[PDB]
Amino acid sequence: NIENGVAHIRSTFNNTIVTITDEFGNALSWSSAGALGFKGSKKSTPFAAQMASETASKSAMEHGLKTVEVTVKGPGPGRESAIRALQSAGLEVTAIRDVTPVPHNGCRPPKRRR
Amino acid sequence: KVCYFTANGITHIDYKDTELLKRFISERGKILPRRVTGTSAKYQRMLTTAIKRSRHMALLPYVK
Amino acid sequence: AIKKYKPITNGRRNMTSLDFAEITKTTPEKSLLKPLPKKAGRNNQGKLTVRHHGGGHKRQYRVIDFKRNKDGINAKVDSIQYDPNRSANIALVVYADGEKRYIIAPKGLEVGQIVESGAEADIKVGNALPLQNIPVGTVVHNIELKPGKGGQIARSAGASAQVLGKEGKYVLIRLRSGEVRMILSTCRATIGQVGNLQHELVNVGKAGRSRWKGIRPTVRGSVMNPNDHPHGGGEGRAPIGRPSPMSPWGKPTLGKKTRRGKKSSDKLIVRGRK
Amino acid sequence: AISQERKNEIIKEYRVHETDTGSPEVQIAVLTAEINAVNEHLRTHKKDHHSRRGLLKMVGRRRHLLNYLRSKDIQRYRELIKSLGIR
Amino acid sequence: MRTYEVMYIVRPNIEEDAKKALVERFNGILATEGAEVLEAKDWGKRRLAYEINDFKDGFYNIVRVKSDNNKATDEFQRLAKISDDIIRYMVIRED
RNA sequence: AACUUGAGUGCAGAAGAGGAAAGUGGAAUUCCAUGUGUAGCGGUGAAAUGCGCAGAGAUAUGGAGGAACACCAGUGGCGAAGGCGACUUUCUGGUCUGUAACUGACGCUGAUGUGCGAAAGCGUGGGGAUCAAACAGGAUUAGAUACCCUGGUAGUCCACGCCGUAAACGAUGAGUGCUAAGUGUUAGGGGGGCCCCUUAGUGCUGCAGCUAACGCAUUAAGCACUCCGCCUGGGGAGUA
């Protein structure tokens, strides 16, 4: 394409899955922190998210991407480093919307640890 | 602070009055706590009912 | 409802019967009754083809309107009656200008309710109208499969299909088994579930009461001789000594799918059950 | 339960004198209509246990008012017991 | 005695000739069985706060009725459910 | 025989997730079908089982089904208690305020009795998304039939019945009256947005007084009167 390809970032307490798709929800490329050789307790780190984002960002430029919408889904440590890893590659981040699903109840949350 | 339902004298909040309700729904349609809006306990209840009626009739967003 | 007999006899301990309270007239009509001479499993040659079928109480056939096609003329329910040839009850209906005919009794159809066939009909229990005009989500019984043939699908006590959606010339319908399928839109149904919803909860009790509906005893194959059945023979009681339970005529019986392939209905079954 | 207009005709029917609302002939009669109304409600909503509890309090109030009336004068007790259908 | 306000939404793609055919008939049941409809207002094609059956807009009609039978409003909701033109309705007892 | 203050009724008002039935919604989870998509996903303290390469995870659209109702939401409200939170309608219970129109003690408590009664459990018939006793593994340990992880059955949901137990607790029976205050909040009333007075709830400090102490203190565990239930060292034993 030319531009307007949204990027979905899944930052959790584990690896950060970063995927770059077009505006109509068609995946171009993707790169998680686990696909970069990162071991556990490395996967959920700001450093790993930095390479995780730009690794998929370079694959986007081959299709000619000049506009990204950052849709972040998850409460993970590697969120902000991921977004600054997209501007550092020159992807012209327009919007920062959080899409972490919030149930209006209606499901039994899995039991917590002990 | 002042209630706006006692100050101006409104004794019946109408769910068709979307403009009046949009002052208490914040940025998501989320009902604002009465501490933030300063409406009394008596009117926080009939305002919540009006808001929920408007949401069902698509006069106010559930989320935004 | 179900009446539980008191254990006055052993052969009658756990027996149960239908209270027959929804029925209102206990006698048929001379002009909508034709003869049914029991055949008992025998064919055009005279040989037993289906088994476990024999003597039973006589029964008169009651002509039913499965093809509800009197379109426009209204009809009054005169009496809900008992039918011996089916699980559900039948209801006499008198049409607004003189003719009378039987139908299948829906769940809460009451005496004196009005029913209408047609295409401009309302969506109420009993009225029959084509599947192009039946809203998505309605319980329907007596569903046709072919335009004008007559209801075939869903006709036994407690049978109900749900119109679930559309395609082009076919409507999607979830039949009682759990199968979703498609039926041509120009075919008729009838709004509502069929009555006698408690027919499935009855207990028979007596051997003879099962031997009054025309059932005959069925012998377990594990006691016939080797020349009578695959499971037969053995000195003593024996397990099934084969890789699979078998049928009298030599064909696997616990799992083998016996639906002819290459049928002209395969393009119409979406998901299946049973 | 019973509407206010419905209650008034019961008041007028069994009032001892004019402007009487508290005599144990109108109170008993009003409760009888009220009791039958909740009884009719519970024919459909059988498991309305919370409403049924208020019915038992009304029955007790009428029973105590009937005991008081009988202990005061038996004539008015006999007239009230037959008009209302109370056994 | 009892006063009801009925608001229903009609799909925004209805044919204009059919709109008066539907609004007429549906205020028709609201005047049956002792119902004496007082107001019958049109609110116009407003924007819905969210998509309803893949619709972004819709016609709003508000009808106020008064009757001590309540079966007029029940008959409305029974037919409003069946009709594919009405996509949302709500009956409020107003006192 | 007489009387209204007790108790009830009448009239004018008030608030409420009080209960039952039937409908209508939005978010989310799961599964299914496709489009894009490529080598991981997931999880831990580290793992691994596990799901993937037969295309998983992710992403977009659509569909099916079940369950619960974010924000409002609070020492907030209602109910005798258990308990009751999406919205609408229909039936329906209780409570509070004011008035003083009516009856003139019609009241309290209450053995036996008769009903209601969280979860779990049972029967019948449905339903089954999520979470899951038990069960399977994978780990940690010296061992781990446990905490951790991966799944997973009954159950969790509905309709009828049955069960009748909970740290069912304010660990505080019900009714009535009296006895310093201060300051809140909920629902009303009357006077001169503010102030004063007042009724009923719900809170926090705090006098007298009580207590072994902790503490209670006008919502007593103080001062009095009526009625019921219960206790008489610990085990054996809530067992015969």
Chains E and B touch (3+ CB pairs under 8 A): yes
Q: Which domains are present in chain C?
A: 1-113 (2.40.50.140), 117-194 (no CATH), 195-274 (4.10.950.10)
Distance CA B46 to C1' F173 in A:
40
Q: How far apart are CA A30 and CA A55, in angstroms?
A: 8
Tokens (6 digits) for C137: 């989500």
CA atoms of D23 and D29, how far apart (whole Å): 10
Q: Which of C14, C40, C268, C3 lies closest to C146, judged by CA?
A: C268
Tokens (6 digits) for D64: 């105590």
Domain count within chain B: 1
HSE at residue D39, side-chain half, CA atoms within 13 A, is 9
| Across all strands, nucleotide nearest D69 (CA–C1') | F106
E84 → chain C, closest CA residue: C135
In which domain, by residue range, is B20 found? 1-64
Resolution at which this structure was determined, Å: 2.6
Structure tokens at D28: 């008993």
E53 touches chain C (CB under 8 A): no
Q: How far is Cα C108 from Cα A64, in angstroms, rounded to an integer?
A: 66
Look at strands C170-174 and C161-166 and give their pairing.
antiparallel
Chains D and C touch (3+ CB pairs under 8 A): no
Size of interface B-E (CB pairs under 8 A): 26
Task: Give exposure, A54-63, as e/b (b: 16+ Cβ within 10 Å).
Answer: bbbbeebeee
Q: Which positions ≥6 away from E80 have C-beta within 8 Å?
A: E8, E26, E86, E89
- Taking CA atoms, C209 is separated from C14, C57, E47, E80, in Å, by 13, 11, 67, 50
Are E61 and E7 contacting, i.e. CB atoms less than 8 angstroms apart? yes
**What is the DSSP code string of chain E?**
--EEEEEEEE-TT--HHHHHHHHHHHHHHTT-SS----EEEEEEEEEPSS-SSS-SEEEEEEEEEE-SS-HHHHHHHHHHHH-SSEEEEEEEEE-
Beta pairing class for C16-18 and C2-4: antiparallel
Residue-wise burial string across A96-110, b where 16 or more C-beta atoms lie within 10 A, e elsewhere: eeeeeeeeeeeeeee
Sheet holding E57-66, edge to edge: E39-47, E57-66, E3-10, E86-94
Asked if residue C187 lies in contact with residue C193, where contact means CB atoms within 8 angstroms, the answer is no
Q: Please name each of the domains of chain E with its CATH number.
A: 4-93 (3.30.70.60)
CA distance E49 to chain B (A): 5
Bridge partner list, C104:
C90
Angle at which helices D26-44 and D49-72 cross, to 10° = 150
Listed by number, the residues of chain C in 133-172 with a beta carbon closer than 8 Å to a beta carbon of chain E are: 135
Contact E49 B16 (CB under 8 A): no
- The DSSP code for B30 is P
C115's enclosing H/E stretch is strand C114-115
Q: Which residues of E touch C123 (CB under 8 A)?
A: 82
Which residues, 6+ apart, have CB-to-CB distance to C231 below 8 Å?
Answer: C221, C222, C224, C238, C240, C242, C245, C246
Instruction: Give residue C189's identity as a one-letter amino acid code.
Output: A
Q: H or E segment at D28?
A: helix D26-44
Using alpha carbons, select from C57, C86, C83, C87 the residue that is nearest to residue C213.
C57
Which runs of consecutive H residues, i.e. helices, occur in chain B? 18-21, 34-37, 41-56
- Residue C162 CA to residue C183 CA, distance in Å, equals 12
Q: Which residues of E touch B55 (CB under 8 A)?
A: 49
Query: Which residues fall within 8 angstroms of residue C32, CB to CB, at 6 or more apart?
Result: C62, C63, C100, C101, C102
Helix H or strand E segment including A105:
none
The domain of A68 spans 1-113
Whether residue B61 and residue E49 make contact (CB cut-off 8 A), yes or no, is yes
- Take residue B64 and report the two structure tokens written for it: 């935004």
What total of structural domains would you count in chain A?
Answer: 1
Interatomic CA distance for residues D48 and D55, integer angstroms: 11
Cβ-contact C184, C169 below 8 angstroms: yes
Handedness of CA C119, C124, C128, C129 (dihedral sign): positive
Residue to test with chain C: of E29, E53, E77, E82, most C Cβ within 10 A: E82
